[PDB]
Design a protein around this ligand. Structure first.
Ligand code: HEM
Ligand code: HEM
Lengths: 787, 787
């Protein structure tokens, strides 16, 4: 038979199975397939040829193709995986056909090895993901200018599928608007142009919005140099420019250097604004852990959405952040999401880098560029030094308040200068011991060592008075004040001091600002009682409750009377017998020293005159002006008025002017005081001048009394180190014809020591304790002399 | 036999041709394929079934196969366009097999259609062309992470195509430098990521080049949700990487806020780095006109140079500048030039906006917000007020220089920190009366009010020393220098002074990297001449070429010469006859304060040795040492050494010091004076003691004699108080044999004016003008007394 040699020498594996599913034929092509030899399977069940794992399902196909023939179908050709005798599940092309061999229902199966074309199909399967995956849409056109294949970017960019765009003109697919009318002419010209070309089109999506597309056509010929294909690519220019301006705006915002979470939120907001129908949010990396960096308020869930992840990497190293964007299906094309993701990721890397650099910068900056002052870093060391040296530091926290008005009105450009002006006033005001710092924003710190209550009640006042007059901006005033808290304690660490200072600083502002306070309620009480005492002193001068007392002075060599001294004296049921060691500085703080001294001298004069008018006389009275410092320009005015109140008898009066030199700062006092001698008052001095030999010890000044203070005589009896200077002062008195008085003496031994040196007047608890205004007349009417 | 039905009833197209090209077998499948009938086909030439246009060569192919053997190929297969009997042409897969009957040559043809396969092949060529048309590389990776496909972009940009790349790891396929930034591990891990990711990598071409690829890996899953393929896209981030570096650098710049011109220069540097041989220019817009803000310095001639412009607009879109890029003709790709235009323009946009704001506020700002120092306008108003008041200042143009080191190494932030550090030194050292501002950039200006050349040079030298110490920052201290220009002219405007000082600073900076001078060299020579004089004094004191004069003091009583006072002199031929009032301050300036005094005392002791041999019995010898300013660092040891040098006990030697100088350090000074007491060396204090008047009487025993200054003795007509000074001295004089010395007597009338006051010693020109070293014996022999 002719069919015998052709079947025998054939390159396709032909096999036949009887109606009972048993095989009866094989060939060398079948041997190239499977692997079994002919005799191994001739007359045996087909199941052995069937794959071992496929045998359970084969009977179903057998029944379907025998009982009903799969709806009376002889067979078909298709691909199937063949498990060769070596166990390899190779791929081959199978074909089936019902046959009537021997009058029975037999089935003939043809097989062909298909490894090579299977590899071609693998190439195509990779190439389809290579085409769907792409940065821009691309579609190839046959000689008749019909769309044949497209990509996922094309589909998601124009709302079209391959089924919808198959075999149809690009313009017919993207039906163009009639406005302008030349769009059709231009697109035809470009599409039918035989050479590579580019142009711009105004396509409108199947689902809506217009896109100003930039389309390009390129040719591809064949061996015969004939038109084989024309590849057309629709690069986006509308959304492409949207991403370009997205990067531009992200860089613009980042150039202002806003804080970390602000940068994250800005990036998220803009990313969503471009890739609408999505949410975005970033995570930062710290200590090898992710922390939610920023998010936009539009975090609502959207159906049919997919996540999309990227990693933030700085100049090198592990990630600095995690990028995640959830986008709803149909929101925007995948390549466009890629375009947004790359820019967002690189911009986020730069954002992380900026914060990282700012960390090391701020942590080590030793001066804040605004105001150029020291900052927290320097203040930390300048407080650690003091705390470890154990010298009690005092920390004031200043807060500028009522500032936001300038920021709102003129803007930051002028609000910065407004702060700098006050900071410069601080510098012009402060002193070498003090240290200044600007910790953050409108908050500053002052470090001091002098920590007396009366010192702080003045430093705080200076700091708060710095801003009395308004700040001049644009020649227009803009007021400000300060809330200043004072921390002062021993032992506690700088951290405790700063915490307390900030507590007080915020507390003052919350109460209303424009003020100052200590941290300690007890220390605040202290000043409350001080203020009450000051008001009481005001009322006291008003109501004439203070008095004066007299300390007798005697000629040390004879026992005759020499003078009396007017020691101020305060009496009060609310506070008992306060001493001049405490009630004078209160008068200085309250500014009533003027009335204090006025009443003192006035009552001294009135007592002197009312005793002169009676049958009693005394050598003189000495009022110590230096105690209240009596240093205003009315220094002679007050005494002149008081003396004129009852006539001028300066010869009967003495005055003490022990300002360290009384001319070291104000020469007007000296130039005007000569009226005292003109009236006859007895000038007196305690200290010894320094410069120019104390102005040649002012022989021109008619000094009368030289007073050796209490301490000198108190310490004299022990040491010749003081006996020598006592000798010198007494000798110079005796030589320059000056009367020397000693303001202290306790027991007979001190008086014995002072006797030999020829001291002229001695006063102290020895001769007579101070005796009030009511019975010193009795003492003088009784005792003369006292030795 | 089944061999007949095996083919006769087959559905696959089958034909057979014998040696004579006659069709011997033609199956019903072949009938339904071609359209002929079996009877019409059998016995006819095979060419009838061949396409008419291809028939002529078919017999030639058959003859070639019959004769040449063709390596006895058993069979083959392919697709060709079959022509049917009706003339229609279709694509039909087919295969050829070689069979032999009766020992002759026969050929068997098998045929199927697979027209959908031809359509898929058309789709496959289309996929290849679609992916290959775009220049972005894409590759596909099997599950095991082996690259299994490539495209034209990848092969062109990496050398390896698929053939030499398939079936191996991408990390090995892609070679990297030796872990420059740990690139190997990053590539390995990213290649192993299971979720979509993207990073950057250095990859070296076949030749070997440092190119950067933005590897972007994405997975593709199957229908059953398993990892199926890994497709990645290496976008060549080289232009993109360059823009990344550009953005980072310019972001760092704009954050650090450099000056506007340096910002433009940085922009130009980056622009030329990304575009070699570029003549880029930033034509900003000022007052509606294009102003050259900056440009790249490489303006070399270019043939048909490519020119482009980018528009710089504010937030509202109004034009504000033009980035004009000029480059080699067509040397820049459109896709990359577009970005170096847009991104650079949009980053410079905020620079321009901030600069416009700063320019609007420039005429009004009063405080530079980087150093806190007053800006140019404050200084201008201050100098205007000073000149209106007729105050000529000295503009210490402190040109803080060498800052370029920190600028190039650590950048603008740490440059500002160093500037704040140096202004900290200036602020702490400047005296209250001085003023300091910042005229521009790094040029500070410290306005003072010192006209003395000595004070000016002292301020310059102390500024130089305070800047000399390394300026610590970031634990890498940098040395810094100053170029202090100075000027001083009465009645000249601020413009005159600031032009002069600026020109002087420029002149000195040009002549050297450090120094300081005046403008108008007419007076700059003063520093050089005084320095030469200082060197000459150094030489003279080292050589011991000075001289001494011995002025005697004559008793106001009837007596012999009380003593001598030794006064150091100097006589040189070149520098003139230098007086004491000149060289003593020069001695302090040059640092021989202790050395000159040591010479003075040594000469005094040697001359004491010389005198005693003759009848010169040395009543007493005072060697001053007050104007020479002995410090405690060298006083006791050196002053005492001269005592033993020639055997003269202190009973005649005398030193002098002012208590105003003793008060400099009260801790130890007079201890050495007591050592001198033990040695017998007397101490004659100055005009009078300072405060407390006691150290001049106890522990120390001065007032062995005390001297009255000539300025007072000759001015007694107004300084009449020196009479009381004399009597105060007389007190302790009669106490323990102490004495006064009125120095400066010039007439017998002054002698009468003094002697009435019981002064014991008279000195001055009148009784005896100073005598040369060797005439003391003559004066002694001649005058006893003169009266
Ligand atoms: C590697 C060996 C084999 C494999 C992998 C295999 C697999 C399959 C599978 C999965 C089907 C379901 C329908 C389809 O896939 O098209 C099928 C159908 C069928 N199989 Fe097999 N089979 C093998 C061997 C054979 C052989 C040699 C025969 C000989 C007749 C056979 C008899 C049939 C029949 C008659 C059908 C009906 C298909 C139709 O009518 O379209 N099987 N085969
Ligand atoms: C549509 C029908 C046919 C077409 C288009 C066609 C075309 C061709 C062409 C162009 C060749 C040259 C070699 C090559 O292309 O690889 C060839 C070779 C050949 N053809 Fe055909 N042919 C057809 C039908 C047949 C048939 C039915 C037979 C039956 C035996 C046959 C026998 C041969 C032989 C023996 C060769 C030699 C191949 C070799 O030596 O490698 N041709 N054919």
């Amino acid at each position: 038979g002719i069919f015998f040699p052709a079947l025998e020498q054939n390159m396709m594996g032909a096999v036949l199975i009887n109606e009972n599913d048993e095989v009866m034929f094989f060939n060398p092509a079948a041997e190239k397939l499977w692997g079994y030899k002919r005799e191994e399977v001739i007359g045996n069940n087909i199941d052995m040829l069937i794959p071992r794992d496929l045998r359970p399902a084969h009977p179903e196909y057998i029944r379907h193709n025998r009982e009903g023939g799969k709806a009376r179908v002889e067979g078909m050709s298709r691909e199937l995986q063949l498990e060769k005798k070596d166990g390899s599940k190779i791929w081959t092309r199978f074909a089936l056909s019902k046959v009537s061999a021997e009058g029975k229902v037999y089935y003939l199966a043809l097989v062909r090895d298909a490894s090579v074309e299977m590899a071609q199909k693998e190439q195509t399967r990779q190439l389809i993901i290579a085409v769907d995956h792409l940065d821009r849409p691309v579609i190839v056109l046959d000689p008749e200018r019909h769309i044949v294949q497209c990509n996922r970017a094309f589909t998601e960019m124009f709302g079209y599928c391959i089924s919808e765009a198959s075999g149809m003109q690009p313009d017919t697919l993207l039906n163009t608007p009639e406005f302008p009318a030349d769009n059709r002419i231009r697109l035809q010209q470009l599409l039918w142009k035989t050479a590579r070309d580019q142009d711009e089109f105004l396509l409108l999506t199947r689902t809506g919005e217009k896109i100003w597309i930039k389309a390009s056509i390129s040719p591809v010929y064949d061996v015969l140099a004939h038109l084989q294909n024309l590849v057309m690519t629709f690069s986006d220019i509308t959304e492409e420019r949207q991403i370009r301006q997205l990067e531009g705006n992200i860089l613009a915002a980042m150039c202002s250097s806003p804080p970390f979470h602000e940068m994250g939120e800005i990036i998220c907001r803009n990313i969503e604004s471009v890739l609408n129908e999505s949410h975005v949010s970033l995570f930062a990396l710290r200590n090898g852990m992710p922390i939610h960096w920023a998010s936009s308020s539009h975090g609502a869930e959207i159906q049919n959405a997919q996540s999309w992840s990227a990693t933030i990497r700085q100049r090198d190293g592990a990630p600095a952040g995690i990028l995640q964007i959830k986008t709803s299906s149909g929101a925007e094309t995948s390549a466009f999401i890629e375009r947004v993701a790359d820019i967002s990721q690189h911009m986020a890397a730069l954002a992380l880098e900026q914060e990282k650099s700012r960390q090391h910068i701020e942590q080590l900056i030793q001066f804040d560029p605004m105001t150029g002052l020291p900052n927290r870093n320097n203040l930390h060391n300048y407080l650690d030094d003091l705390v470890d040296k154990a010298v009690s530091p005092v920390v004031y926290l200043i807060g500028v308040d009522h500032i936001q008005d300038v920021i709102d009105s003129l803007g930051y450009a002028w609000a910065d200068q407004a702060l700098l002006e006050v900071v410069n006033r601080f510098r012009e005001k402060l002193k070498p011991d003090q240290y200044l710092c600007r910790i953050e924003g409108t908050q500053f710190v002052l470090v001091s060592l002098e920590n007396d209550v009366s010192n702080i009640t003045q430093i705080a006042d200076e700091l708060r008075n710095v801003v009395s007059k308004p700040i001049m901006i644009d020649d227009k005033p803009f007021p400000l004040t300060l809330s200043i808290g004072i921390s002062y304690d021993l032992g506690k660490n700088r951290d405790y001091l700063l915490s307390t200072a900030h507590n007080a600083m915020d507390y003052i502002r919350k109460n209303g600002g424009n003020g100052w306070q200590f941290f300690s309620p007890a220390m605040n009480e202290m000043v409350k009682e001080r203020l009450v005492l000051g008001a009481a002193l005001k009322e006291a001068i008003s109501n004439n409750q203070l008095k004066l007392v007299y300390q007798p002075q005697i000629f040390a060599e004879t026992g005759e009377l020499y003078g009396i001294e007017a020691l101020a004296r305060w009496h009060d049921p609310l506070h008992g017998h306060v001493p001049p060691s405490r009630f004078i500085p209160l008068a200085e703080e309250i500014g009533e020293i003027e009335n204090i001294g006025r009443w003192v001298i006035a009552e001294a004069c009135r007592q002197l005159a009312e005793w002169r008018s009676q049958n009693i006389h005394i050598p003189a009275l000495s009022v110590n002006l230096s105690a209240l410092h009596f240093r205003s320009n009315q220094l002679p005015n007050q005494v002149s008025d008081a003396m004129h109140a009852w006539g001028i008898d300066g010869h009967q009066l003495t005055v003490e002017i022990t300002e360290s030199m009384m001319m070291e700062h104000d020469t007007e006092i000296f130039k005007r005081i000569q009226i005292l001698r003109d009236m006859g008052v007895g000038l007196s001095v305690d200290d010894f001048g320094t410069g120019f030999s104390g102005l040649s010890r002012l022989v021109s000044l008619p000094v009368t009394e030289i007073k050796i203070d209490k301490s000198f005589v108190d310490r004299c009896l022990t040491e010749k180190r003081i006996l020598a200077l006592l000798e010198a002062i007494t000798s110079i008195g005796q030589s320059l014809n000056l009367t020397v008085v000693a303001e202290g003496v306790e027991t007979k031994e001190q008086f014995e020591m002072l006797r030999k040196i020829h001291c002229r007047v001695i006063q102290g608890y020895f001769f007579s304790r101070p005796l009030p205004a009511e019975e010193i007349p009795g003492w003088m009417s009784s005792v003369l002399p006292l030795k």
